[PDB]
Design a protein around this ligand. Sequence first.
Ligand SMILES: O=P(O)(O)O[C@@H]1[C@@H](O)[C@@H](O)[C@@H](OP(=O)(O)OC[C@@H](O)CO)[C@H](O)[C@H]1OP(=O)(O)O
Length: 1086
Amino acid sequence: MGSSHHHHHHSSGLVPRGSHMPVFHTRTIESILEPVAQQISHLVIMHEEGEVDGKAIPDLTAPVSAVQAAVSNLVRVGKETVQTTEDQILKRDMPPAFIKVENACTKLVRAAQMLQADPYSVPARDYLIDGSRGILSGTSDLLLTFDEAEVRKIIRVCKGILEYLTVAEVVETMEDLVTYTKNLGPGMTKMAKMIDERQQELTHQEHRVMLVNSMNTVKELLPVLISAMKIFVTTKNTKSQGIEEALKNRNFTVEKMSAEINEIIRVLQLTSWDEDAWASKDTEAMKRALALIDSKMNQAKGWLRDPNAPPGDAGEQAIRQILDEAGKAGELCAGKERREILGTCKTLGQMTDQLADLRARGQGATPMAMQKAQQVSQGLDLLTAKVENAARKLEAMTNSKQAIAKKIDAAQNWLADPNGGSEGEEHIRGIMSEARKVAELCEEPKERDDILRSLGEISALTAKLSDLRRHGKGDSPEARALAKQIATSLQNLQSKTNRAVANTRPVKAAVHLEGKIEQAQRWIDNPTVDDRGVGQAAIRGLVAEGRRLANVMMGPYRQDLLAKCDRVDQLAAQLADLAARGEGESPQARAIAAQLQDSLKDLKARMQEAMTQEVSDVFSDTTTPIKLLAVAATAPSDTPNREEVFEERAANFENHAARLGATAEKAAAVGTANKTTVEGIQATVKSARELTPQVVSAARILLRNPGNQAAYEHFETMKNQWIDNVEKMTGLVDEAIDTKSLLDASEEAIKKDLDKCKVAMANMQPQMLVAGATSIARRANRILLVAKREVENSEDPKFREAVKAASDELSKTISPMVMDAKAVAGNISDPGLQKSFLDSGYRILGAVAKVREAFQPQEPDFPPPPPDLEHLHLTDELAPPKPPLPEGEVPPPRPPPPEEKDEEFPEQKAGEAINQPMMMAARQLHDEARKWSSKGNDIIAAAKRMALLMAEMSRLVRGGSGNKRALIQCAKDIAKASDEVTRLAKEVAKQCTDKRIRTNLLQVCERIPTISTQLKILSTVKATMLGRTNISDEESEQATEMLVHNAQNLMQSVKETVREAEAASIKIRTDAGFTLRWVRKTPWYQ
Ligand SMILES: O=P(O)(O)O[C@@H]1[C@@H](O)[C@@H](O)[C@@H](OP(=O)(O)OC[C@@H](O)CO)[C@H](O)[C@H]1OP(=O)(O)O
């Protein structure tokens, strides 16, 4: 190849974008590559038709022509694209892509002519895989470039309205305001329109939701940004004191919209899986932790200030709340920024025990004990401030990453197309600028110091390049030969930078509870790679939620909860030590797999149980507080205490709203829900936190302006936009708790809260009636809401009507506590209080309990059958002779078929070379489908085959033979299986009367047709790259990662179709056709 002595040595410049991923992230791209790879697999199985038999590879002027015919049209506009429209990045990128296309469909007709002439020809079996792969890589890169532009149009339009929200600060005159709407309007419909059209085209749903959610927030925040500018221009007069509550209600609206438009822009440039999501998740979580602390700080800084000793439940559990929530934040840190923060938690954790013991000893004013309570006060300051750090460092570190990305666009347009000017130069100053922010918000000696080196060297080159341009030499064999050298190090910058982001995110776990159990419950497999990591790191954040949950409880339950937390942790730290010994081999570690795997299963039941109570209490009244800020802020007339009363009602509203979100997370964290209802609830919780201040600012603007409507306009727009989050918060929270068990807690709550009305008279208070019917008012109104949700959700008229009935016989029974406790408010007129109050009020609890029974089994009855027929032993005399006049007589014959078996796993190990994640993907689907009989049940049947082929593909990858034709069939079979699962999973859902069960089943099983289509393409590829050429062998190492993470998804997404399919099996229609057989596998059901 190297065509001279001197020059061909330095020239390492075929290096713009020459080792790229394949992409199938749009319906167009998927539709093109699906057949291309279909066609190209033949020629990768014909290339193996000169190995097995070593035989002649037939006439290819028909196959390789229809191959050419496929990607012919694609360049017949792909050349007509590049010269026509003035796209700069399209121009330099479009050709070297389709130079590899035509390279192929040429290089397949050169090697076709080698075998058309000589059907035995190895100079073409040299150049067939190099010729094939080309057309795959080529068209991938060709279709990709074509798309990157369709996106660039959009990010353009978006970046525009990002820049146009800035000019919100330059808007003073009501005259100008409505001309802002005039010229914002048209440029938002085109964005929403551009986005909506683009989402349709997307394969990864994961993405389509982040888009669809983000752009909706944007729409619910014009009605607000519109408002906020009007109450900023309304307040331009000598009578407008608190003028800036508007300005910050208005800049909240501009920041959040801007953080959504940015989230949209980022999500749009996604071509594959998403690694940068997690940093916003954790960043949110710490804001959530900090917030909860911020609230409970002074409520327990007064604990330490005060010598007087109440060491129990009042504001000691206020201090340990902080220390749990700051412990939870430190968890989401990595390295030793984590170890410090948790290190401070266990120090100030024992200093409190030191004190709390000393407070029982009356030692409140002892000179060491006052001093020690001083230390904890200074401790919480430091710990709150050290979490406030790690929090904004994680946001700042990612904001810098998201900032480097949207610039490297035009930074590569400056660095090659050798003019740019001032306009282009700033794009590489800008990226260098951020690399320094990473390094100073990094916390290692050697991690920052390596970046400052890279930054120090791109500094020198970029100064040299800059001055050559300036002293003419901009067009020269030094102005390109160097400016080459830079784009190399400017890629190296994103390495050392992105590596610095990835070193501040720790071994992550499931966001939902039932996920976190699997990641742990999957220590039936005691020895494995990075399950020392994630297997503990779930169990770690499961007990750390048990601990978090017990620290806002009564002392009896509390220690009862921590007793389980500490004995589970103990049986897990046991096999943590036991497994590492040599292996946690079957004998001893069986003893824990009966105790811990069943113990950990009760800790859940104790966490949910409790969580169910804290939701039953806290969510009973979502509105009283902000409904008291309405009547407070309105201010019936004038008593100057108004300000201080509005504060106490506005503080009650912040105290309470903070509680709702803190509980809302606690249900997301520990309950029923999928990852989707958990994420749902969290966005809710994030908006409650954000909006709460924003309402009270508008609620202030009302106190200072008695008579204004424009103030009342902002109140109701904010007041409702906070409710429209809460009513939603409450929708996603009940959905994530057992309804049967919610109705228990709430019945038990109405019982206890009835007594407080019985013994409101027996004590004698007239309002403790009305406060003990603030409960049974909103509580009984909540049990009707919870049943109104379930009837909207069901399609089983037999259930639907039994609960629509027990609803009736309670909705009316709001009388004998509204206009009944209203009558005898003050009265103790014994006969005329209790004759209608207790009588009809305890039949209210009788109705509640009929509503409960409407959920309890409809079809099945109480007494089952025990069949004990004492089989005796009266012997049978069936004596066998053979008769005289005929000959040869016996029972029937035996054909080939068997008795019964079931093909369990070829669990490969002992000096074998496999893909360790791929097998571990395959062994996990098996485990789930292994549970169930495959006998009336092609879904389990399929699932079991799918996970068998995915163990073959695990052994059909590493090293590898001349079995490329095998890897094509293995992945061909896997696709065909998956299509059966999808066939059946749809028929199940279609028969299922529970809509949340149905919908969440279609959502996990409609992933599978695409995922398997991709797995086919990746399999047709990697085949072509199976131990071949030397430059090939650094692509064939990164190209597994895609296929690996693509196999992980299929096994996971099929595993959840199996479960949800069985789930949706149970609640099936009355006269329903399709039903598969769900029977757990026993010794007696194989
Ligand atoms: O290898 P692919 O992934 O493309 O699989 C295609 C599928 O339609 C598959 O179901 C096969 O169905 P088929 O019904 O054509 O099976 C062959 C048989 O009828 C006579 O030998 C195709 O052979 C097969 O298409 P083909 O006709 O190009 O071989």
